C-alpha cells in the first residue's frame, strides 16, 4: 500500500460556510475550436504542416462548460473568521470520456473578489482540486457527494508549487463538521498564505492535512507527487480514464503559451470512473490579504473528428469542429480549412 503520514489529531473539522448564490456569476467562456481550446495533441506521433483530419475525444465547439470559482473565507481585518465555499461538494458530475479544465483564464486582470463585492483585487491564477470515484454514495446526513472506496483525489499544494494525486479509501472523522460528526458541513481544503506560501515556510502535506481531517486515507493504493511551476499564463489540464490506465495531460509541461494539451503523467488505475466532483477550496487570509482568484472552467469530452492545422513547430494553432454546423461540415468534407463558397450537402 502507501503511507500518507500521520493522520490529523485535530478534535473537530473546521466549520464551512456555503454561499452558492454569492459564488454564482455571469462569466461565459465558450470553447473556441479556432484557437484550439482544450484539444489534446495526438499522442502517437508529431504531424506534417499540411492540415490533417484526426478523430479523438474532443469538447464541443461553442460549449461554455461548467464554471467553478475559489474565494477567500470571511475575514475580519485582524484575523479570518470562517471558511467561504460554494455548494460544489453536493453537486455530482458524470464522468464518461473525461473532462478538460481551463486554468488562469481570468488571471492578469482586476475583478471584485467573491467574498466582498465592494473589495476589488487583481485576479491571480488558482488551481482546481478534483475527486474521481468508481461509485458514489449518500452522506450520513443525507447530503449528496459522498465518495466510495478507492476514490482518486488530486490537490495542488504549496500555493501551486506541487500537484499531489493519490487513489485511496476515504474515512470520515467523528469530529464535529466532519461528515460523520454532528453539524456536518462539506469536504473542503483550507490553506493560509502566510503559514505555507511564504518562501522557506512551504509545507509539503499542508493541503493533504486539511483534506485528511474531513476524510482519512485508508489502504491507499499509491501516492504520487508531480512538481508544476506556478504561472499566471493560461494552462489546460486534461484527465481521461482508459482500460490501460488514467491519463493526465498538462499544457504547462510542453506548451504553456500555446495551450495545447500533452500527456505528462500516466496513472495505473484500471477501475472505470463514472462520477467526478469538484472540491471547493477556501483561503484562510485576512481581508487585506484576501485576493481575487481565477475561475476554472470544466468541459466534457465526446468522440468527434476535428480538422487539425499544424504549424512548422507542429503545435496545433487552430482546429475545425465538423459536427458543430453545416459550414464546418463543408470544410470537413473538403478537408481544407479555407474553401471556395459553393452549394453543399446538408442534413
Amino acid at each position, epitope marked *: 500500500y502507501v503511507d500518507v503520514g500521520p493522520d490529523s489529531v485535530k*478534535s473537530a473539522c*473546521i466549520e464551512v460556510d456555503i454561499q452558492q448564490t454569492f459564488f454564482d456569476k455571469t462569466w461565459p467562456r465558450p470553447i473556441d475550436v479556432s484557437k484550439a481550446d482544450g484539444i489534446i495533441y495526438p499522442q502517437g506521433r508529431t504531424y506534417s504542416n499540411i492540415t490533417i483530419t484526426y478523430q479523438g475525444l474532443f469538447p464541443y465547439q461553442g460549449d461554455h462548460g461548467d464554471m467553478y470559482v475559489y474565494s477567500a473565507g470571511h475575514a475580519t481585518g*485582524t484575523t479570518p473568521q470562517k471558511l467561504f465555499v460554494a455548494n460544489y461538494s453536493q453537486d455530482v458530475k458524470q464522468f464518461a470520456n473525461g473532462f478538460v479544465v481551463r486554468i488562469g483564464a481570468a488571471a492578469n486582470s482586476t475583478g471584485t473578489v467573491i467574498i466582498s463585492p465592494s473589495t476589488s483585487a487583481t485576479i491571480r491564477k488558482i488551481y482546481p482540486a478534483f475527486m474521481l470515484g468508481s461509485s458514489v454514495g449518500n452522506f450520513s446526513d443525507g447530503k449528496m457527494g459522498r465518495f466510495f472506496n478507492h476514490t482518486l483525489v488530486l490537490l495542488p499544494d504549496g500555493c501551486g508549487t506541487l500537484l499531489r494525486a493519490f487513489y485511496c479509501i476515504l474515512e470520515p472523522r467523528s469530529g*464535529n463538521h466532519c461528515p*460523520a460528526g*454532528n453539524s456536518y458541513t462539506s469536504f473542503a481544503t483550507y490553506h493560509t498564505p502566510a503559514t505555507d506560501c511564504s518562501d522557506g515556510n512551504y509545507n509539503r502535506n499542508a493541503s493533504l492535512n486539511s483534506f485528511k481531517e474531513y476524510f482519512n486515507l485508508r489502504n491507499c493504493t499509491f501516492m504520487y507527487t508531480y512538481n508544476i511551476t506556478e504561472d499566471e499564463i493560461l494552462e489546460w489540464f486534461g484527465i481521461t480514464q482508459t482500460a490501460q490506465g488514467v491519463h493526465l495531460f498538462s499544457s504547462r509541461y510542453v506548451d504553456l503559451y500555446g495551450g495545447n494539451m500533452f500527456q505528462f503523467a500516466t496513472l495505473p488505475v484500471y477501475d472505470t470512473i463514472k462520477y467526478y466532483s469538484i472540491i471547493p477550496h477556501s483561503i484562510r487570509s485576512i481581508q487585506s490579504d484576501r485576493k481575487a482568484w481565477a475561475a476554472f472552467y470544466v468541459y466534457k469530452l465526446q468522440p468527434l473528428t476535428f480538422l487539425l492545422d499544424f504549424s512548422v513547430d507542429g503545435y496545433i494553432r487552430r482546429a475545425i469542429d465538423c459536427g458543430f454546423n453545416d459550414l464546418s461540415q463543408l470544410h470537413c468534407s473538403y478537408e481544407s480549412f479555407d474553401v471556395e463558397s459553393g452549394v453543399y450537402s446538408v442534413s
Partner: antibody
Amino acid sequence: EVQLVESGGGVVQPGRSLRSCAASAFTFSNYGMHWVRQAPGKGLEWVAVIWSAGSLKYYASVKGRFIISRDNSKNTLYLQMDSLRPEDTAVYYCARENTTYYYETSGSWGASYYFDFWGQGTLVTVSS
Amino acid sequence: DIQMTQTPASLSASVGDRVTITCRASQNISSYLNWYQQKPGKAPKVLIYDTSRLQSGVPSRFSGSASGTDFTLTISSLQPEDFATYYCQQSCTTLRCWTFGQGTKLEIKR
C-alpha cells in the same frame, strides 16, 4: 427559540420497558441529541449520546441497556429503559451539545454552541 | 476508564473570600476539560470548555487553570447565591464514556 421537553417518565416495576424526549421550533436534524442522568448522591453523567444522523449511538455504566432512536421528521428522540433498578432510577435530561470551533494559527475562537433550552428532566421511580 | 476524585467533598467558605476548588483525574486524557456549576432547580452550566478560554455567558470570577493531572478553579468575592455544587468533566473524543464530577457543596465559614 430551542424548545426541549422529556415525556414518558413514570413509576415502573423492576425489569420493565419504559419509552424519551421531544424537540420543537429547532433545527433538530443537524444537531445531535445527548441524554444526561442525575441521581442523588452521585454527579451528573451522560448516560447516552446519539449523532445527528442517528446511524451511530454511544451508551455510557450500562451494557448498552438504553436504546435510543431519533426521528427528525417527528422532531422527537425516543429512549428505551429496560431492567430498571431503584439505584439506576433517576431524573433524565436531554440537551443538544455542539463543540466550540477554534483556529490554531491565529488563536481565533468561535463559540459555535447551542446549550440553550437544556432539558428540565423527567423523574422515573422504582417503588414496591 | 478514568478515576476522578475531587479533593474536598464539601468546602466551607466565608462571604467575600478567595478559595480554590481542585478536582484530580487519574490522568489528563485531553486538554479540553468541561467544568460544570449546578444549582438545584437550574440546568447544568459549563464554566470553562478547554481551561484556556472562559466559556461564553460565564462570569470572570470563576477561572479554571489545570496544573498536572489536577484541575483547579479559582473564585473571589464569594456570595451565598454564588455558592453551588461544582462538577468537573474530562472530555475525550475517542472515549464514549464521560467523566462525572463528585460535587463540592459550598457553605459560609464563620
